[PDB]
Structure 1
Amino acid sequence: MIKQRTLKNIIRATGVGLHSGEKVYLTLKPAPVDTGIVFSRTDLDPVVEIPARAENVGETTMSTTLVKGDVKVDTVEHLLSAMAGLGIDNAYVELSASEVPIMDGSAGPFVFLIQSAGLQEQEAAKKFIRIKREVSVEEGDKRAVFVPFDGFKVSFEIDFDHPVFRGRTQQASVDFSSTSFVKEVSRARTFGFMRDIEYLRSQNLALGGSVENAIVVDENRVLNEDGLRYEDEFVKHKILDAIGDLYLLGNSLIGEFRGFKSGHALNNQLLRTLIADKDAWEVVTFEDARTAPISY
């Protein structure tokens, strides 16, 4: 059978919150079968735990935030993307502050941590959510869709008209049958338009932002001296974001995601909309891995 997966060891890192700018301690720990991913604010007294589930998502305007009453864990999507890409079912995530460190702006550092911790197979069947019927959500010209697919595929299109984006592909369709999440998606950095970053900083926001953890573009060019890590790094980060946001389902997907100019808000709306309709999905396991449309 395809088994559930956790970490072999506890592993740690430090960084700053993109939004808050404050130093934060991060800890990844093994967890028992059927735990899922659980975030803990270990700085609080008592310590507050928030399961990484779609229903616990609060505001999504900037990043995906988990909320439990007045306690928040901000910017979970890049770390969760790495968890999803490496097929980590169960883990504890401890934080000394209200935001996951931005690190280098991608999922790369978290892939590195998870891999360094080691992967532990557990004696329980891994559950998958299989999309049975196409489900979609919209806001204006923005659209997020689940489509039936015998495997796991993420497709995305962005549609920026700014000169800096002219001629760029602005579209990618990743079938993970033949694409490595680690090598081809995970190191895609977050990006920001100079005007938008300036507006945030003017309000004492995005205090942790720098060229060392974000691609900065103005109307016409990429400001980072070393350019891009991937030729299509922009859309690949949108795909990265989607994979992380989607993992708040609590299980790996058998199906396709299609995003069109969408972000965290529509991603979460899509999840809640899917979950509510039980004719649109089912939970499956694989007693024989060779019969599975996916592989970890």
Structure 2
Amino acid sequence: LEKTVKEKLSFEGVGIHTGEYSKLIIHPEKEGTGIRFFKNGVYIPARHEFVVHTNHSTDLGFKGQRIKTVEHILSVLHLLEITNVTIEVIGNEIPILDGSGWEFYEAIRKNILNQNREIDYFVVEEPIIVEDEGRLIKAEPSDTLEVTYEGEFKNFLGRQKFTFVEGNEEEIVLARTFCFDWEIEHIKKVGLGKGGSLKNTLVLGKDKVYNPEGLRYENEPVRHKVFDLIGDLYLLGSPVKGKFYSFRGGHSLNVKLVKELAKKQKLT
């Protein structure tokens, strides 16, 4: 049934690309309200259609207002099945914190409440293949939500794939975002990642790990990618059901899958 937060929640922390202090406040809403962001007295529904800028991060914006990196929180909400919540975002981007969703998943999981209404699950009824930038993603109808990601790294990790299935969400929430020392300069050359640090960004070396804690999962970096792929699929504003596969996929290409899925099922 519709799920909402039992009590008001709030978080605070710098933004990975903005590197500015930002705070978020979450309040309960009415059943069938959906996920919406509020700022400067402006409400901004969280749906793909609201996608204003796609890049290493997912950004939404309406009426001249914009928010960066909103896929992470959306990913946790997706796994927890949250249908009504007003996330007030004070700032220009969602705080990166440690780089994973474990923090939001940890506090919110202890403050979830049940409402009195049945949720409308989104189910894929037809497959689809999107190829672009040398990347590719395929979707297939299914009675269970499953997402597979095949990442190809040229570092010591080499190639690694991670299959997520309903009942293994605990393995895709503690995976913090990661980056390679070779692509970092590029991300920095585009004026992004000004808040990226070793405490909120896991940096890997062609053959060495920068963070002294090492990797948290033999597939931590791909676990985060899968976690992000869901955060981008929840843009539909409702739990997605079906079997999806992604090979070296990005945010824009991912949103494209959702765009065609939401525009294809437009007839129904």
TM range (shorter): over 0.9
Distance 2:86 2:33 in 1: 9
Q: Is the 8 A contact 2:155 2:205 kept in 1?
A: no
Q: Does 2:64 match 1:74? A: no
Partner of 1:127: 120
Of 228, 237, 252, the match for 1:241: 228
TM-score relative to the length of structure 1: 0.86
Q: Which residue in the other structure is 2:161 paired with?
A: 171
Distance in 1 between residues matched to 2:133 and 2:186, nearest whole Å: 24
| Equivalent residues of 2:150, 2:248 under 8 A apart | yes
Q: How far did residue 165 of structure 1 move?
A: 2.2
User: 13, 16, 26: which one pairs with 1:15?
Assistant: 13
Q: Distance in 1 between matches of 2:49 and 2:55?
A: 16
8 Å Cα contact 1:159/1:261 also seen in 2:
yes
CA distance in structure 2 between the aligned counterparts of 1:279 and 1:95, rounded to whole angstroms: 30
Shift of 1:149: 1.1
Name the counterpart of 1:29.
27
CA contact under 8 A between 2:146 and 2:164: conserved in structure 1?
yes
Structure 1 contact 33–124 (Cα < 8 Å) conserved: yes
Identity among equivalent pairs (%)? 36
| 2:212 pairs with 1:225 | yes
Check whether the contact 1:194–1:218 (CA below 8 A) recurs between aligned residues. Answer: yes
Q: Distance in 2 between matches of 1:224 and 1:72?
A: 32
Determine the structure 2 residue equivalent to 1:180. 168
Post-superposition Cα deviations, 1:226-259, rounded to whole Å, max 9, x if no partner, equal: 1111111111111000111110001111211211
SS at match of 2:163: strand
Which residue does the alignment assign to 1:261? 248
- Deviation track 1:194-213 (CA, whole Å, cap 9, x = no partner) reads 13223333565312111111
Contact 1:245 1:268 in 2 (8 A): yes
CA-to-partner distance for each residue in 1:124-166, whole Å, 9 max, x for gaps?
1111011111022120321122211111111111112x23322
State how 1:1-296 maps to structure 2 within 5 Å.
Answer: 3-41=1-39, 44=40, 47-116=41-110, 118-160=111-153, 162-166=154-158, 170-176=160-166, 179-181=167-169, 183-201=170-188, 204-278=191-265
Structure 2 segments unaligned to the other structure (5+ residues): none
Instruction: Specify every segment of 5 or more residues in structure 1 that has no aligned partner in the other structure, as ranges.
Output: 283-296
Question: Counterpart of 2:57 in structure 1: which amino acid?
Answer: S
AA in 2 matched with 1:175: V
> 2-side partners of 1:198 and 1:209: how far apart?
12
Whether contact under 8 Å (1:132, 1:279) holds in the other structure is: no
Offset at residue 113 of structure 1 (A): 2.7
Deviations 1:87-115 (CA, angstroms, capped at 9, x unpaired): 11111111111100001101111102312
Contact conserved, 2:173 with 2:227, CA < 8 A, in 1?
A: yes
